[PDB]
Amino acid sequence: PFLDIQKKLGISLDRHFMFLSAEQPYKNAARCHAFEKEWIECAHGIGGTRAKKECKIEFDDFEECLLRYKTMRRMHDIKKQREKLMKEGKYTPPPHHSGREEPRP
Amino acid sequence: MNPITLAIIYFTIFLGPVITMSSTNLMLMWVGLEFSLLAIIPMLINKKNPRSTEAATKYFVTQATASMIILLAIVLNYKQLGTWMFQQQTNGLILNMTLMALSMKLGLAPFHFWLPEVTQGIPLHMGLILLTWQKIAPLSILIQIYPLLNSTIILMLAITSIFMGAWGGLNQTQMRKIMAYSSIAHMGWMLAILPYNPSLTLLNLMIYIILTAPMFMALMLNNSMTINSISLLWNKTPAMLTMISLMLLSLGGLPPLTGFLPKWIIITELMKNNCLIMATLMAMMALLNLFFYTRLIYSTSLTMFPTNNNSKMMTHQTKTKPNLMFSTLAIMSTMTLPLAPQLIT
Amino acid sequence: AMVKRFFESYHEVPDGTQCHRKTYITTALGGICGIIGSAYSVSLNPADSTLEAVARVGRYTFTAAAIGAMFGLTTCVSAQVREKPDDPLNYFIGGCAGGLTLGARTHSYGTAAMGCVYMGTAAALFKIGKLEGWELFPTPKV
Amino acid sequence: MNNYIFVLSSLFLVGCLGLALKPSPIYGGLGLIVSGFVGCLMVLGFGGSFLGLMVFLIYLGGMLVVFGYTTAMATEEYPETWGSNWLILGFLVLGVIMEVFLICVLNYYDEVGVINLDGLGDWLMYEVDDVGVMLEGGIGVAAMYSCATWMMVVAGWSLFAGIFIIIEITRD
Amino acid sequence: MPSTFFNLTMAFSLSLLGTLMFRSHLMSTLLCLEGMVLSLFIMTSVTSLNSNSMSSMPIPITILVFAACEAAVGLALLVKVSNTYGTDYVQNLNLLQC
Amino acid sequence: YPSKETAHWKPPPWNDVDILKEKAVTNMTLNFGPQHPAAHGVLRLVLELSG
Amino acid sequence: LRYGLLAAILGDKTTKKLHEYSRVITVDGNICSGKNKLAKEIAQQLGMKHYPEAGIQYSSTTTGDGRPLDIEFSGSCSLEKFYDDPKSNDGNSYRLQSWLYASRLLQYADALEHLLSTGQGVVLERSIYSDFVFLEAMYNQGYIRKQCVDHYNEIKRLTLPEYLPPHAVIYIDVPVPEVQSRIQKKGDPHEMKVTSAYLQDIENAYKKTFLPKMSEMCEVLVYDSWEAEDPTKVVEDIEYLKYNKGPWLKQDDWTFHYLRMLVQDKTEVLNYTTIPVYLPEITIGAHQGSRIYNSFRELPGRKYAPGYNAEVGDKWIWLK
Amino acid sequence: MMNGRPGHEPLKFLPDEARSLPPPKLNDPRLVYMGLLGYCTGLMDNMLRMRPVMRAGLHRQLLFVTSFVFAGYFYLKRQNYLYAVKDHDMFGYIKLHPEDFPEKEKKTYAEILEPFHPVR
Amino acid sequence: LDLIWLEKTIPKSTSTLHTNMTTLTTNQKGLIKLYFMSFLINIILIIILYSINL
Numbered sequence A: 001p002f003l004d005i006q007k008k009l010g011i012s013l014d015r016h017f018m019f020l021s022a023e024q025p026y027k028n029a030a031r032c033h034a035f036e037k038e039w040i041e042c043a044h045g046i047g048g049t050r051a052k053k054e055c056k057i058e059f060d061d062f063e064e065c066l067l068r069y070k071t072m073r074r075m076h077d078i079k080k081q082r083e084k085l086m087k088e089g090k091y092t093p094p095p096h097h098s099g100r101e102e103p104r105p
Numbered sequence B: 001m002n003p004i005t006l007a008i009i010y011f012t013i014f015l016g017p018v019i020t021m022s023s024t025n026l027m028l029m030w031v032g033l034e035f036s037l038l039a040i041i042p043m044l045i046n047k048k049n050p051r052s053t054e055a056a057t058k059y060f061v062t063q064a065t066a067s068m069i070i071l072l073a074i075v076l077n078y079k080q081l082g083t084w085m086f087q088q089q090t091n092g093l094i095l096n097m098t099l100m101a102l103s104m105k106l107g108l109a110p111f112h113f114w115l116p117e118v119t120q121g122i123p124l125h126m127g128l129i130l131l132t133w134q135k136i137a138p139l140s141i142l143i144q145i146y147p148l149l150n151s152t153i154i155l156m157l158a159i160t161s162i163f164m165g166a167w168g169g170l171n172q173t174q175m176r177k178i179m180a181y182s183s184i185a186h187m188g189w190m191l192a193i194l195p196y197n198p199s200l201t202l203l204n205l206m207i208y209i210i211l212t213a214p215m216f217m218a219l220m221l222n223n224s225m226t227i228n229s230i231s232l233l234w235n236k237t238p239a240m241l242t243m244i245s246l247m248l249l250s251l252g253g254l255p256p257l258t259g260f261l262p263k264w265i266i267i268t269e270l271m272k273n274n275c276l277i278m279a280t281l282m283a284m285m286a287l288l289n290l291f292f293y294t295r296l297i298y299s300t301s302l303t304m305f306p307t308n309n310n311s312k313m314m315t316h317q318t319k320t321k322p323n324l325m326f327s328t329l330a331i332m333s334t335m336t337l338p339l340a341p342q343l344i345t
Numbered sequence C: 001a002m003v004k005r006f007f008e009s010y011h012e013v014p015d016g017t018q019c020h021r022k023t024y025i026t027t028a029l030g031g032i033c034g035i036i037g038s039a040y041s042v043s044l045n046p047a048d049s050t051l052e053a054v055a056r057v058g059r060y061t062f063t064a065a066a067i068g069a070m071f072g073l074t075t076c077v078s079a080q081v082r083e084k085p086d087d088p089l090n091y092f093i094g095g096c097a098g099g100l101t102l103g104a105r106t107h108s109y110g111t112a113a114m115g116c117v118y119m120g121t122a123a124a125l126f127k128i129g130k131l132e133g134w135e136l137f138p139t140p141k142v
Numbered sequence D: 001m002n003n004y005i006f007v008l009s010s011l012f013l014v015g016c017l018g019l020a021l022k023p024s025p026i027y028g029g030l031g032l033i034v035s036g037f038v039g040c041l042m043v044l045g046f047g048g049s050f051l052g053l054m055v056f057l058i059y060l061g062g063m064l065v066v067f068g069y070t071t072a073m074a075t076e077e078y079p080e081t082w083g084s085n086w087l088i089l090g091f092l093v094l095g096v097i098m099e100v101f102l103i104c105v106l107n108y109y110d111e112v113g114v115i116n117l118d119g120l121g122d123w124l125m126y127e128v129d130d131v132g133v134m135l136e137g138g139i140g141v142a143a144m145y146s147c148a149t150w151m152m153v154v155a156g157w158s159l160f161a162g163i164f165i166i167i168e169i170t171r172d
Numbered sequence E: 001m002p003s004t005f006f007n008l009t010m011a012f013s014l015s016l017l018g019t020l021m022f023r024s025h026l027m028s029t030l031l032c033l034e035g036m037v038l039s040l041f042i043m044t045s046v047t048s049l050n051s052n053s054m055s056s057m058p059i060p061i062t063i064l065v066f067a068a069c070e071a072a073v074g075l076a077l078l079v080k081v082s083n084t085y086g087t088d089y090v091q092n093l094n095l096l097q098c
Numbered sequence F: 001y002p003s004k005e006t007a008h009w010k011p012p013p014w015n016d017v018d019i020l021k022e023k024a025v026t027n028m029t030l031n032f033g034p035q036h037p038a039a040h041g042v043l044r045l046v047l048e049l050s051g
Numbered sequence G: 001l002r003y004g005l006l007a008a009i010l011g012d013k014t015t016k017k018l019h020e021y022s023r024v025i026t027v028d029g030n031i032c033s034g035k036n037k038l039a040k041e042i043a044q045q046l047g048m049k050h051y052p053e054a055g056i057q058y059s060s061t062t063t064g065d066g067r068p069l070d071i072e073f074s075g076s077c078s079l080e081k082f083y084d085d086p087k088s089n090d091g092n093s094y095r096l097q098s099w100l101y102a103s104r105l106l107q108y109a110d111a112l113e114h115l116l117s118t119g120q121g122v123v124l125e126r127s128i129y130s131d132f133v134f135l136e137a138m139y140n141q142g143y144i145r146k147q148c149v150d151h152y153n154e155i156k157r158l159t160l161p162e163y164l165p166p167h168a169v170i171y172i173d174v175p176v177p178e179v180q181s182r183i184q185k186k187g188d189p190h191e192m193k194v195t196s197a198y199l200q201d202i203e204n205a206y207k208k209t210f211l212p213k214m215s216e217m218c219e220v221l222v223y224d225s226w227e228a229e230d231p232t233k234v235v236e237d238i239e240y241l242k243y244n245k246g247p248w249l250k251q252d253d254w255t256f257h258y259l260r261m262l263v264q265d266k267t268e269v270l271n272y273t274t275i276p277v278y279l280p281e282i283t284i285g286a287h288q289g290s291r292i293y294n295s296f297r298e299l300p301g302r303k304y305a306p307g308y309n310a311e312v313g314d315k316w317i318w319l320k
Numbered sequence H: 001m002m003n004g005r006p007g008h009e010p011l012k013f014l015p016d017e018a019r020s021l022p023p024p025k026l027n028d029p030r031l032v033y034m035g036l037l038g039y040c041t042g043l044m045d046n047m048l049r050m051r052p053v054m055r056a057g058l059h060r061q062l063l064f065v066t067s068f069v070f071a072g073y074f075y076l077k078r079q080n081y082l083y084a085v086k087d088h089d090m091f092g093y094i095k096l097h098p099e100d101f102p103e104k105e106k107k108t109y110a111e112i113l114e115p116f117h118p119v120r
Numbered sequence I: 001l002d003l004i005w006l007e008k009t010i011p012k013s014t015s016t017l018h019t020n021m022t023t024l025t026t027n028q029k030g031l032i033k034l035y036f037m038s039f040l041i042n043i044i045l046i047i048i049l050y051s052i053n054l
């Protein structure tokens, strides 16, 4: 803040729900709680400028968990390569992918 | 308005910026911007005539539209990072949209056309509030994210504001417009130095506030809106000419007045970063401010414009204004250059 | 982005050479200023029609294009007739030809004089800027 | 059913396109109800419930008032409808063409990044506690009474002050 | 989710275009300011639900709380503009050029 | 500085209270009867109404 | 504790002070129609404060030592010179009229401030609502220019609406042939030069503008001379008015509060009479203007704010 | 610049470690100029109100002088601490990164050939 | 020289130029409709500027 009054008085008006890994009602973790909790602990105390380079590994992983750009890309490529094979006629999905599995339990 | 309304409305006006300034979360910063927007509106339109209603309307639609854009930035950022604060990793376009919206809220040119008109339609004391206290909230947000701001956007806005404020003020006979364009030009200086040294933006804001406050108080003494109205001060409150003149030269950045310090230190720090071209144009167009401030000084303290018969009654009467704050702010805003090293740092 | 690449094609080769490529660039560059000027012009001081609106856009953009084309040619022509590339006086001659064109299109001898001097000096300082590496919008160092 | 959310967001988009062309506020208030309803269905599709019905409830009372103000202050003799003027009718039709173009274009140059028409539906719900009990959006919104009590102070004060604010604005 | 935000974000842009491109009625420009609130609320609601962040679900409600106040304050001003000229046309609000 | 286009501008009023050409007061004129369950048959009550 | 918000919030409220005779009464009429006597007995009988008609020297006698000032400090106009030469090209006529409006406007604020601060009623002879009859008379006879009339209507438009009107208006109708005779038996050599066509124009403005304008907001009482010659008859007519119209009905504590802040601030009262509109009639060059201003500040008790003048026996200055 | 340095308490006017610095002298040229700025204010106040400029209201004038010296004393003490901290952080940085601030041996003028520029 | 061409070139042309600019940029119609329309242009120029710097 610009007037760290909350920090001075030791209270917390809005500091305790700043990010995903904050406390949630009934102890329900947020999506990507593990990754964010890692990134915030990596970049703690070293400052913003150091953290932008020295916690790039933690951040790029959190960014991938949150937005899943690579995951959608990867699953787009698998499905699009399978589309091509099936049009040619060199691949027929398994029974458990065509709606005929033996369900578990 | 009855005392309950004033207590509620004036508390809310004060509350807004304090919420924006003390808040870690961005949504609570936005909330404070809403409190200021909502509570000022009844103050602006209190006299209820065709001009204050237009002023309170132009202000509302401008500041509400800017609010929605700021909120979009706060929300696109929560989508990108799952957090309620801007990070080094925040998308670049998210930051720029915040900058343009906040400048729209400050009145920085080219998003400035609303400010001179709104200041024109409202009473003097609400122009004081609007041109001073109401600037701290948007600025306190900007100072919290200065490592992130794109300097090219900031300098184009500052150069524009210094030029438009100079050219706009040069054509004005209405004092309230001269104060709005004065504000636009000074915000250019605060903003130009923001991404480099935010402390100098606070120095330039504070010195501007203590110069702009007594100037309004001086016009509120006789309720003088024009250059011809203020020209009668020699026959109404001649004791005021000594400090009106210095404050106007001080607002103009002339040495050895306190108002030279902000421009001089901003230029010095801009050239520590090799911002030579921008700094030179800024200082060269600040000269135009001094011209139409000089023209005002010509009309008030260095000449005696014709006066009217009815002003003799005005002299028989006794005034209870100004208060002890005018004198304190007049001296500090003009005779404090020898304390410069204690103000910058 | 490409549109940024195009405007950097102006400084890949020493002044006075690839003369039309440079004249084309500054002609487009002037047009972009003319279009941005018209946008504000028509929006803030609207015309009485819509054809009359479009006319003002065309009149500003061709004039702005003309200034850019006379600047980018006169600079490149002077810079090779004198065989002096790294020289601000070239850009002062081009900037003034630009200023003369502005006055010619505006029916104002006074503008030509002001335009020849103000724009010539602005053009010269742009050249002196590139030689000495002055940045318009530097980034925070300290 | 794989296109379900995409269609709701496409309908939402049009409702705001029609709204942006600004016909008579009688119809602008009709677009906000249908966008409000469409948007309510999106928050429901993504798993919400309380948040979906509230924004629908709140915008139902807002347009009721707005209707009363239109018939008193924003009504002219020949209220404009989306078909009333050929020029607006052009941009409503053209506006729909553009989205059919932007979606098709932007889908061509990335295929996954922005619009992934190939994979509509595959990426709606990411995670979900399958054995959960306490997960309704109402529980999250209800945190204002215990955890984010600050949210409610500013919200309550905003409304409290507003009564004083409007009574003075409208005063004679 | 990707396709939804793009459509939601473009919905916000269309209303920002609507707000920035006035016609006659001031009331119509007020409804575009509600088109923007609705777009932002739906984005925030979907963001919070998708990421399972329950602690952020108070925030979309405050947006509605602080959006009503504007709608109320906006409508209150529209009454004063109508009491002066008998309509809400923006072209009437131009006395302050001088 | 006078310019041809602002040659028609006037100085604002000394107290910000701009004189306006008197606004048209129009009330809704409504026929209440003859055919109306409350008119008692043959009353054409022409009412001028504000709200 | 000067009146202000904190004084009102702690109890100083007007509506408690008002009683049936907390009224503003204005006695109007032509020249030598008996306003002085009638206004003085209305006030004495009803327990109201009497304000004699505001003249050239009204504000000299309410400030300082209450002694008349040299005519250069007090308006630089002459009623006697108006009657001797009503068309003089030194602008006396409209200077006199413009000054008289300002002094009346000040007396009205003095009268109203008394009403709202104590509850006692006031009786004024003419006021700022009837003042215009004299202006219209001047213009019809060619004694002022059309621009002077515009400048009067401008100042009036900026000052009159701020104030509440009289509760009651007591016009005294005297026909000109009788008026012209009363002026002749009065005595003043200058006042006997008044034209009867000027007196008639004062009577026409009264009956064609003043009285129809005031009946829409005030109880108006019109008395022929013989009815007025017994003031007790007029006061019994005032004790039974109902007062069922006008702005005074819609007034509460906080409308009065802001009217009381206006009328206690005499520079705020007079503010708009001094607007920089440059009629040669009323404009003063800096040389003459500065000479006068400086001479005025060397007057006994006028050099510093009241209470800091050691000349006139003020004490404890170094602690005030 | 120094906002987020270690151990920086929030909204602390004069941290404890400032007490290791010598206090401003009471008759400091900077404090004394505050006293004069206070005195002028009292004079300007009397001028604006139309009172005897120097004779009137000496209680006010005394309290204007006292207020500005009192506030200036404590404000001066804070700026000394801020300036002391700046050097403290500046020099400790030089120590922790010696390879970045190398000591240089500067040749004497016997060995330097400054070009000569005749003035004819 | 002194009375004419030295006036015309420096002090007079400088005052003419700046009077010319203060006339162009100050004659606004006071219409919120036109102001927002320019605010719309500003926003697009910032979008375009940021676009060609990616």
Ligand SMILES: CCCCCCCCCCCCO[C@@H]1O[C@H](CO)[C@@H](O[C@H]2O[C@H](CO)[C@@H](O)[C@H](O)[C@H]2O)[C@H](O)[C@H]1O
Binding pocket: B002, B003, B004, B006, B007, G009, G252, G253
């Ligand atoms: C200015 C800030 C400092 C003050 C702090 C806030 C506390 C103020 C305490 C003083 C309160 C006086 O405020 C009081 O308000 C009420 C309404 O609430 C006004 O009363 C009003 O409503 C009542 C309702 O019965 C009616 O008589 C009438 O409509 C009106 O007078 C009173 O006239 C005023 O006396």
Ligand SMILES: CCCCCCCCCCCCO[C@@H]1O[C@H](CO)[C@@H](O[C@H]2O[C@H](CO)[C@@H](O)[C@H](O)[C@H]2O)[C@H](O)[C@H]1O
Binding pocket: B010, B011, B014, B123, B125, B220, B223, G258, G268
């Ligand atoms: C923690 C809470 C913080 C509370 C902060 C309070 C800030 C101080 C606010 C001061 C407000 C008073 O300031 C304001 O003074 C001006 C005079 O200049 C008055 O304004 C006046 O203007 C003109 C003449 O001056 C009159 O015609 C008008 O009727 C009247 O309103 C206002 O009625 C009063 O509101």
Ligand SMILES: CCCCCCCCCCCCO[C@@H]1O[C@H](CO)[C@@H](O[C@H]2O[C@H](CO)[C@@H](O)[C@H](O)[C@H]2O)[C@H](O)[C@H]1O
Binding pocket: C100, C103, C104, C106, C107, C108, C109, C112
């Ligand atoms: C190699 C160097 C070449 C130097 C020449 C290039 C610069 C030329 C500048 C031309 C400036 C304006 O050019 C001049 O504008 C005037 C405007 O008065 C116009 O002149 C025409 O119209 C004007 C009215 O405006 C009449 O008064 C004039 O008699 C008529 O000839 C022409 O268009 C041209 O005569």
Ligand SMILES: CCCCCCCCCCCCO[C@@H]1O[C@H](CO)[C@@H](O[C@H]2O[C@H](CO)[C@@H](O)[C@H](O)[C@H]2O)[C@H](O)[C@H]1O
Binding pocket: C107, C108, C109, C110, C111, C113, C114, I001, I005, I006, I008, I009
């Ligand atoms: C050591 C001293 C040096 C003195 C230098 C003298 C050289 C002067 C050469 C100037 C030649 C150009 O001549 C130019 O004439 C026009 C006449 O319209 C003047 O300009 C005038 O007319 C123009 C139209 O063109 C209008 O904008 C305007 O009415 C006015 O500026 C210019 O101010 C002048 O610059």
Ligand SMILES: CCCCCCCCCCCCO[C@@H]1O[C@H](CO)[C@@H](O[C@H]2O[C@H](CO)[C@@H](O)[C@H](O)[C@H]2O)[C@H](O)[C@H]1O
Binding pocket: C004, C007, C008, C010, C011, C026, C029, C067, C068, C071, C095, C098, C119, C122, C123, C126
């Ligand atoms: C008519 C008078 C006008 C006077 C000015 C004359 C202008 C004529 C020169 C045309 C210049 C073209 O403008 C061109 O802009 C690009 C924009 O990246 C500059 O580009 C430069 O800055 C960018 C910053 O974004 C750097 O990343 C880049 O490495 C560098 O080349 C070019 O150096 C410049 O040549």
Ligand SMILES: CCCCCCCCCCCCO[C@@H]1O[C@H](CO)[C@@H](O[C@H]2O[C@H](CO)[C@@H](O)[C@H](O)[C@H]2O)[C@H](O)[C@H]1O
Binding pocket: A083, D002, D003, D006, D007, D010, D011, D014, D117, D118, D119, D120, D121
């Ligand atoms: C208010 C107007 C609302 C109208 C909105 C538009 C409704 C129609 C939705 C269009 C969206 C895309 O709609 C449909 O999406 C699917 C998957 O989701 C695309 O993709 C489908 O075919 C591709 C091959 O092309 C295969 O990978 C697979 O069978 C499937 O992904 C289809 O090519 C497209 O037809």
Ligand SMILES: CCCCCCCCCCCCO[C@@H]1O[C@H](CO)[C@@H](O[C@H]2O[C@H](CO)[C@@H](O)[C@H](O)[C@H]2O)[C@H](O)[C@H]1O
Binding pocket: A011, A012, A013, A016, A023, B015, D146, D147, D148, D149, D150, D153
């Ligand atoms: C002057 C204007 C302002 C005055 C009005 C505002 C007064 C403040 C009232 C709001 C009080 C909120 O009070 C604040 O509540 C929050 C949670 O709600 C508490 O904060 C708590 O949050 C959660 C609770 O689950 C814990 O994880 C956290 O560690 C704890 O600090 C603060 O300890 C308390 O200070």
Ligand SMILES: CCCCCCCCCCCCO[C@@H]1O[C@H](CO)[C@@H](O[C@H]2O[C@H](CO)[C@@H](O)[C@H](O)[C@H]2O)[C@H](O)[C@H]1O
Binding pocket: D017, D020, D021, D022, D085, D087, D091, D094, D095, D098, E014, E017, E018, E021, E022, E023, E024
């Ligand atoms: C391009 C397809 C994509 C969708 C496009 C639509 C996006 C939404 C735009 C909403 C704004 C409409 O933009 C519109 O601009 C026109 C000018 O063109 C202006 O409208 C004004 O001029 C037009 C043209 O004569 C009149 O028909 C209209 O009655 C008048 O108000 C308004 O400012 C705004 O109503």
Ligand SMILES: CCCCCCCCCCCCO[C@@H]1O[C@H](CO)[C@@H](O[C@H]2O[C@H](CO)[C@@H](O)[C@H](O)[C@H]2O)[C@H](O)[C@H]1O
Binding pocket: B284, B285, B287, B288, B291, I014, I015, I016, I018, I019
């Ligand atoms: C980068 C900045 C460097 C330049 C510094 C600024 C210096 C100031 C120059 C601009 C201001 C001077 O502006 C100058 O004002 C004078 C004032 O008489 C105007 O002149 C005007 O005089 C009077 C009153 O103003 C009017 O009656 C007349 O009709 C008009 O000509 C000139 O037309 C203009 O040229």
Ligand SMILES: Nc1nc2c(ncn2[C@@H]2O[C@H](COP(=O)(O)OP(=O)(O)OP(=O)(O)O)[C@@H](O)[C@H]2O)c(=O)[nH]1
Binding pocket: G029, G030, G031, G032, G033, G034, G035, G036, G037, G053, G079, G082, G096, G097, G100, G131, G134, G135, G186, G191
């Ligand atoms: N031009 C001008 N003369 C005025 C004005 N008010 C008063 N006078 C003159 O000043 C004198 C005031 O005396 P009056 O009160 O009107 O007449 P009177 O002799 O006192 O008789 P009564 O007062 O009714 O008892 C009159 O001669 C008027 O002509 C004014 O507003 N304008």
Ligand SMILES: [Mg+2]
Binding pocket: G053
């Ligand atoms: Mg008398």
